[PDB]
Write a protein that binds this DNA or RNA. Sequence first.
DNA 1: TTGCAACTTAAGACTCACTAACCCCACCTTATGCGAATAGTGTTGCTCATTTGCTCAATGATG
Length: 126
Amino acid sequence: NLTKEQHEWLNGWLELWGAWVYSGRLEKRMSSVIAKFMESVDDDGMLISQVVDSVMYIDKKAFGILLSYYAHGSSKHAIASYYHRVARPRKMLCRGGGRIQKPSLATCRREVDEILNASLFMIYPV
DNA sequence: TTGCAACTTAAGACTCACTAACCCCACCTTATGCGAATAGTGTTGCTCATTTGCTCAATGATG
């Protein structure tokens, strides 16, 4: 797990990073997913963009979520809201049981939280 | 003779008019503007209860 100084440090880096990118100052060549986000609208931001694209290159879903939170500046609650909207029925050993249904909102909140913590966790040493 | 109870007539207000069924249609709108207040609703960090999977723990049944 990361610490909280690392949280605030790299948090501020992703704040100026997403504020830098979202103005449109980044090129297509960094990612086609970064290009995808730029279809939906300095060396610091390009260095970090190589970092974040390098680590979060492989998932692209939480990478897009990461752009939604930092580049766009969206609240966590709306992200888990739409994410609960796009939910499919899954197998979970629930408080209810191992039946197969669409999960609750608070579960989706937990998932945005843990994909946040794991995302930041995988970014930080890079 | 005169008042007075008593009888008579008339005027007026209220109630009230069979039982069941089927079909159709018609149903009810015009100041602006501004600030203040409030309700709502949005976000987030943080609980609490509840089902399963699973492990210990013993005890008589069995090899």
